[PDB]
Design a binder for these strands. Sequence first.
RNA 1: GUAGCAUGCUACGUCAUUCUCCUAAGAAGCUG
RNA 2: CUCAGCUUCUUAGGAGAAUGACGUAGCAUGCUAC
Lengths: 926, 73, 186, 186
Amino acid sequence: AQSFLNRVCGVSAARLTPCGTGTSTDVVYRAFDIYNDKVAGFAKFLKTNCCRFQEKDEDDNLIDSYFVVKRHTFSNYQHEETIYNLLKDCPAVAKHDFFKFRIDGDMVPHISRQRLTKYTMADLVYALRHFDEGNCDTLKEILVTYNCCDDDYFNKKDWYDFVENPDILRVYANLGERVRQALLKTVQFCDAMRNAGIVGVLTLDNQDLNGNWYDFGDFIQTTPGSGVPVVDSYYSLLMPILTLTRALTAESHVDTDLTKPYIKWDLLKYDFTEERLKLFDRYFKYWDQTYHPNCVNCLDDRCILHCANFNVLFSTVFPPTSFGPLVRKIFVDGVPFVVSTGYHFRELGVVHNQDVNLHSSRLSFKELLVYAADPAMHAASGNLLLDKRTTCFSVAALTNNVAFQTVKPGNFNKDFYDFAVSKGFFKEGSSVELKHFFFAQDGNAAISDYDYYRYNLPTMCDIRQLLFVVEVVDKYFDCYDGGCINANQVIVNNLDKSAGFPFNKWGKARLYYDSMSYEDQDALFAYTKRNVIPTITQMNLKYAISAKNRARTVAGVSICSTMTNRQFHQKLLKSIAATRGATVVIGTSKFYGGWHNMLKTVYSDVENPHLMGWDYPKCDRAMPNMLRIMASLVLARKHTTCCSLSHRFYRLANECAQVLSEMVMCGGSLYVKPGGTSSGDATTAYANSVFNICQAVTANVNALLSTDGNKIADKYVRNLQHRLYECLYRNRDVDTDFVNEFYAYLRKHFSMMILSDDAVVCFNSTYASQGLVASIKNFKSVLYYQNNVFMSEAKCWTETDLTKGPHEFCSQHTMLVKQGDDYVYLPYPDPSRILGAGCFVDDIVKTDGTLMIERFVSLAIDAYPLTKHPNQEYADVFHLYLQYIRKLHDELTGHMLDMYSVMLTNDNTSRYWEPEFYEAMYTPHT
Amino acid sequence: SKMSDVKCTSVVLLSVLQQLRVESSSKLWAQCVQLHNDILLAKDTTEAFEKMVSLLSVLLSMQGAVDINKLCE
Amino acid sequence: FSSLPSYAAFATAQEAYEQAVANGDSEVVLKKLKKSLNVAKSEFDRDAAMQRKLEKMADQAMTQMYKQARSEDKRAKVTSAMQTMLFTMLRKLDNDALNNIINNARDGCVPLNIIPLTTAAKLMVVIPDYNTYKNTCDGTTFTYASALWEIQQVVDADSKIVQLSEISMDNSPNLAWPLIVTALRA
Amino acid sequence: FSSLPSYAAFATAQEAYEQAVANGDSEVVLKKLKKSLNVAKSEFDRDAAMQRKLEKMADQAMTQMYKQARSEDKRAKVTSAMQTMLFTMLRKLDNDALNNIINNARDGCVPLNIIPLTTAAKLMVVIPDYNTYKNTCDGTTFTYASALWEIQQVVDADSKIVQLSEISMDNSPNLAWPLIVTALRA
RNA sequence: GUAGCAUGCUACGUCAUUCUCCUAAGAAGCUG
RNA sequence: CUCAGCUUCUUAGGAGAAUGACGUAGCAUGCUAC
Ligand SMILES: Nc1ncnc2c1ncn2[C@@H]1O[C@H](COP(=O)(O)OP(=O)(O)OP(=O)(O)O)[C@@H](O)[C@H]1O
Ligand SMILES: [Mg+2]
Ligand SMILES: [Zn+2]
Ligand SMILES: [Zn+2]
């Protein structure tokens, strides 16, 4: 073996310790992206052909430099020689050494390479894309072998989590430079092999962690002056890492290095189109598709989604004070107003209002509404603010003193607690115990809850994958009828709700829905279809009972935006709510056999079913901007016949300016939302359902493409993945003939039941074990790398038996019971929840049972199913509720008789303390 | 069943404190509210009783507002 | 739904029809009396329906008024009703520490600041009489909240430190009560 | 209706029915006018119903009109109110520096985030603890956003004025963090 | 064949309730 | 102080259906009178 080592390192003076066993191939198990005619996908392949050899420096030790000395046939060897000879000059390439050594009796060509790391960029993207703590040693080695973080940092509890410790981000950023180096050297490679007349496909698995490209077996020579690197399969699998590691962090420094002062961009610079184009031509020069810096010039929703995915990466370079509304000085009646005549979106680029009405004449109700909704004069007349409680940019402080709001403790119903403890409840060792209380918070409640947006990192997403997942997700929404409706066709449940800031100062939403007639509402909706209206959204504090002391703030979005978003999405949302049997079960009641119908729907002919499910850790705040934009797009695909491209883009811009990243008023002070859906917009539940379906489809795609493909014995599935890879990374336009095929495959082997962040799935278990459909590990990985949150074993679950049913959905457990001579699924809630609801109330008057009997009637309606629970105390909960309702009625009758010499007339109320009235709530008749 | 009674007592006591306008003192209100929250999510009984001691002491400090001589009975 | 003038006529018509069927009158007379019945009954039923609707309206108004009155009562006496419940539950718990501190507060021996719980504890108490002082303190130890605290400082009501030996039965009038005792956890 | 002229006709019927029935003679005529009374009643009832319907609609119309009026009035109110707010928040503009920054812009269009950062005459730092206070806001003057901010007043979470000498590492616990320092542009 | 009465039936006006649907309003509960 | 979904209870209005009843028009049959 000495001769082989000498030949390998003959030219290099460096030493060489053989990792292999005497000129024997070393076992290599990496993440080679592959696309052959009989194989496809981006999966961990056991390719054992390289002979890794390491270099030893003085004070013998092994640095991260290896010689990957593999063997090739003579024809491939000659082709590699010719291709390399035309790429020697370029520095973004490995210094190949081609040698001819006899092994036994013939000259097998021993091609070799120099100064190559142990892992490639494919391994880096695979470990960060498919990350399960059960097996993540490759990410450990990558982060420890490049000084990103000390090894001992891996002993921390939840080191990988983006919520338990945000410091993990600081670790990932240490990789960014390397990426941003290998993200630039590739361009050189491209350029070189475009000027050398070489055409081929660039793959991540042919690039080591310092940028060198070390494989030329798949290149053919076109005439010099021509040549096309195909980076669709490279820049798309590497795309989500460029924001996870903040690769373009060395772009805010002069000379673009980490050891120089940040560039001092003039405050007035709002249009960065030129810098965006320079960045695109610098890092993504050979991206085959047209990149529009401003998305107002984009062609279709699949283009507004391509160039917006680059603006989430190029907009992490520009200062955070350049975004938000662009203010211009208009003149009304002579007085100069300052108004938002545009918006510099972090994603949609710079957008200018089509009709900026400077030198106006007079302002009517709609004009005053648009001028008072936007934060132009709110942050133009307001003390500069440096609120250091939040890590989110603070624009201004409207008032002269900060406002601190506390959360009250929640009254206590002594009567019900006495009754329960007199009926044998609330003991030691009982399974049913109080765990739901009205928690209280200090004066930093609202701001501390709003500070949870720090989990909302700026996420760039794999675009070639999202542009297909969006087609499939719309396929899931293909059965609805949606569009734009007039002002007189809008249905609003409560007009007695807040109008948002500053409209909550003068009245409720009723006063702004009735004051301006349908004509003004339609004018305001057609205004948003060609103008961007920024708005302010309070962060109100929610007073609700829970088993955790989270504050649960909710965005009180402004009326000027809620009106228009309703007028835009109402038909589609109502059509989503009013259809039964669909994947989205919003609007489907759990009573009158609805739960059983849903459960049997999820089981729609799944070959080997057994369910799983999930609850996003923090959906509202952790949601990325790209996924929210995609949700707002696929909910606007129903307007193909009513709204043009420009109108739909301006509606997307309005939605982004009013929901996605809008400056909130969290206690008399304007802040800046990093991103993510606000939990007060007109499409919160349905947008969450869209995002959930998108994550599920992405998990399916990653599980079907991350399979080896050689061991798939189902020909149809093998070809399904072989065409899925083509439709993702080779095809460019929507392929309906395969989009519907894959949608059918999912709906067959992967059932779903989506209600916002609640998801129940009835995947075909045998396939999931095989790897042909999304398991729960796949969903965890997808959430990790796309949604930049880690999902632990407290939101997931998996029920191997259908009879028991889903472990939880909407916090209601499921049980199979014999009622009506047929086994039916009944949802029983958590008994502790019901006892807590009874014992603890919001208002002091709710602690007097006689006043609130309907409270207990409704609580018994919700708690009846426990009566059939095997545990005796679970049924005792419902029986106790019935007895307490009877006791309350007796007390009410006695009080009426004593206070007034009149007896309570009519006795229709005898139903409430008899179980018949509550079994009728789960009989499928009505 | 004292474990499930200290939590209700803590809720009642924090309500009583909030009625005494201890909420208009951010530092003391933060102390008492954190004590109450820790009492609620307590799986032990003795620890909840020590936090109950502290909360009741918060109530006792306000001698003027609460007369515990003739209304303790 | 009786006591109305229509029900009397209806009952008389019922009695007349009963007498007719007893006599087995002819079908023509039977029909005539049956229609006299049906008209009297049709009047009484209408009147009784009016009475029933009026009564249901009155009952709903009365119960709404009762709701209003009891809600106003519940809101009015909300402060004292919460303290009574608090002390009832405190007595029910019957813990040693809570009972001890409540008894001390009965005599006025309140704490100046929250009672700490750690070894590095700073507890300040007010001792307004020598009776409570001797009951609670004996030497250089202090009993409070079922806890032992070491007397670190004992300052009079005029901010003057007092040597421990000075406080005696014969020296009690000399000191200006109350005392303030600062102690640590033992 | 009760006063409707058709009532008179009905009355006549009843009057005749109250007269001829008293006589109880002439046979056929008694049977005839009874039907006429049924004719007298029916139409009258019908007319009554019609009138009642009209009355109901009239009431509804009035209510609707009244409702509209209220809305209009409220609309106007808000309009005026909203105008006032704008005017107020228009006058608080530091129009000198605001006009300077607008004119210095390339096309009169500048971000909103830089308006407070460049024309605001008062900074207001909310400091959650003391380490942050000494890091950023220390001294009687400091620098934020390239300006010389003069600390004008420090208040705590209770709105209690805090003298700059009270903010110390040793004395920090006894303060009610956060602190709201309302600096001023020099 | 006309007048009157009786039984039945079809249609319309009138009411009596019961049920269903729904238009709106109020109170409350649960779900993401 | 939010955005949607479902459920219970209460009140008012409208329509329809079921049964009970009155009145009128028409048809079948029966009866008194000429
Ligand atoms: N009261 C609400 N108002 C509006 N939206 C809500 C409300 N509660 C929940 N949501 C919306 O539903 C989604 C999830 O609600 P959920 O109650 O599960 O909170 P969560 O954010 O999932 O918190 P966690 O999972 O950590 O308990 C939220 O993401 C929010 O957008
Ligand atoms: Mg959740
Ligand atoms: Zn485009
Ligand atoms: Zn449309």
